[PDB]
């Protein structure tokens, strides 16, 4: 009765761990690109301001 409940629960826990992780992958993926876009834009505005000041 013990191992039936164990592998049952482990199955469930790991199912949830995997799904949580998957949800976390997306959220970080969104952040990355929001950061990725800002860095690029930031680097560019620094260059423009530098050329325009001449």
């Amino acid at each position: 009765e013990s191992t039936t409940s164990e592998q049952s629960a482990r199955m469930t826990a790991m199912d949830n761990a995997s799904k949580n992780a998957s949800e976390m992958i997306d959220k970080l993926t969104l952040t990355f690109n929001r950061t990725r876009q800002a860095v690029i834009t930031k680097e560019l505005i620094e260059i423009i301001s530098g050329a325009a000041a001449l």
């Binding site: 876009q37 800002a38 505005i45």
Partner: protein, 479 residues
């Protein structure tokens, strides 16, 4: 010869015409190019005028003659614009001949100050159950419609427009609502389809459509909302009620960024100019409710904002939330799962609408808000399973198709069923079915009561007890 009323084009190509002369022009005054294009004096410099071009500057050459028009940028205004499709300047684009317009109003007029206003108080009935009950709107309020592409945003605006027919065919003049749909950045075919849709619903006869589409020049796209807004103000300041839709402001800010970067305005967050907030703020400030001493008129503004990947925290989304009086937020995930209209209730607010919600809706709505508040918290003991039982079912009640907006009394009878537990015994995949069978039954058999609820604006103790009969009688016979 005359450089006081006239100038010649020095340079052109950055969407900005440098113009020698024009010594007597005003700031923000419309000018008129030799090719028929309109323009706006923006930069009054010692030796030139910077003129923003209200169309395709391919048509402007060096040496072209520009004339003053004497007028600060304004647009045609009045009732003759109803049933018409116009471009951002007001010139008709539906090819139904000239607008027979009698007054004109400036596109940049400062919003009404503090004194002439009073807090919103008359319902602006969308006809969408989820909105009118959970995110209710009053006339004069600004409510943002916000979400990723393809989440049902325009739908909210359209059914709202279509809903007003019920009043616009009455003789109750204060109960009426004239609509203006401002298309900034959309596909022209999308707009054309839309007025066809409106025409089909006989709604176009009380709508003004202002169009500044994907292929109109940027300055036009930027102007359209203000042009739209003055047309609205006509009704606001005249004891009448207008609703305006800025569809959508994301695209308009894009229009404005293009103008500012070409004008060499220092780029800030996401290359947007310092004044990107002010661009929207001044506009939406112009939606207002006027007290009885200034007519009692009102302009309601439903602006549209397009999020990237449900990110409400980005520059432009937050600017506009920082302007309007709450938001309907539309989730891609909800839309995907077919939950429609895809309203995230938790993240949606109306900062001022509770005051302008009918008592009749409020009596079923307050408890629905509450039971849905409990259900989100727990998405096998007695109590907490029942809030699941109730929750899924209220969620099915908020579903609704398009182009069938609902009279307020019809909405409450439906929600009554829900909030009085009558739906608990049935299965989730049958609530939609029960709703339509039940709604059409009461429309055909129990008109007296639905009218009485509309007329009393309330559910009376008789009405309630009478509506207790109708539901029990129907549910026992629903198969």
């Amino acid at each position: 010869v005359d450089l006081e009323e006239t100038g010649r084009v020095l340079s052109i190509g950055d969407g900005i015409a440098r113009v020698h002369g024009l010594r007597n022009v005003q700031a923000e005054e419309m000018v008129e190019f030799s090719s028929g294009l309109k323009g706006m004096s923006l930069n009054l410099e010692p030796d030139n005028v910077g003129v923003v071009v209200f169309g395709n500057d391919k048509l402007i050459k060096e040496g072209d003659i520009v004339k003053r028009t004497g007028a600060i940028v304004d647009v045609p205004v009045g009732e003759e614009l109803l049933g018409r499709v116009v471009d951002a300047l007001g010139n008709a684009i539906d090819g139904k001949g000239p607008i027979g317009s009698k007054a004109r109003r400036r596109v940049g007029l400062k919003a009404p100050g503090i004194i002439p206003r009073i807090s919103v108080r008359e319902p602006m009935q969308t006809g969408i159950k989820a909105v009118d009950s959970l995110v209710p709107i009053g006339r004069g309020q600004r409510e943002l419609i916000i979400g990723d592409r393809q989440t049902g945003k325009t739908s909210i605006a359209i059914d709202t427009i279509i809903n007003q027919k019920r009043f616009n065919d009455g003789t109750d003049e204060k109960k009426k609502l004239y609509c203006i749909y401002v298309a900034i950045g959309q596909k022209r075919s999308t707009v054309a389809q839309l007025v066809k849709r409106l025409t089909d619903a006989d709604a176009m006869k009380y709508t003004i459509v202002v169009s500044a589409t994907a292929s109109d020049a940027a300055p036009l796209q930027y102007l359209a909302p203000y042009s739209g807004c003055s047309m609205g103000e006509y009704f606001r300041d005249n004891g009448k009620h207008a609703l305006i839709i800025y569809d959508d402001l994301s695209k308009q800010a894009v229009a404005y960024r293009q103008m500012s970067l070409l004008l060499r305005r220092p780029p800030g967050r996401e290359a947007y100019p310092g004044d990107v907030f002010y661009l929207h703020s001044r506009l939406l400030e112009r939606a207002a409710k006027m007290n009885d001493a200034f007519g009692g008129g009102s302009l309601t503004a439903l602006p549209v904002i397009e999020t990237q990947a449900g990110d409400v925290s980005a520059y432009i989304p937050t600017n506009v939330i920082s302007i309007t009086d709450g938001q309907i937020f539309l989730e891609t995930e909800l839309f995907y799962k077919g939950i429609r209209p895809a309203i995230n209730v938790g993240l949606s607010v109306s900062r001022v609408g509770s005051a302008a919600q009918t008592r009749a809706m409020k009596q079923v709505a307050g408890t629905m808000k509450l039971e849905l508040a409990q259900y989100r918290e727990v998405a096998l003991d007695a109590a907490t399973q029942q809030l699941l039982s109730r929750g899924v079912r209220l969620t099915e009640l908020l579903k609704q198709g398009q182009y069938s907006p609902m009279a307020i009394e019809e909405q409450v009878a439906v929600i009554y069923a829900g909030v009085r537990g009558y739906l608990d015994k049935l299965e989730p995949s049958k609530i939609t079915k029960f709703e339509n069978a039940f709604l059409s039954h009461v429309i055909s058999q129990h008109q007296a009561l639905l009218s009485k609820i509309r007329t009393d604006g309330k559910i009376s103790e008789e009405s309630d007890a009478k509506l207790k009969e109708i539901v029990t009688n129907f549910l026992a016979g629903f198969e």
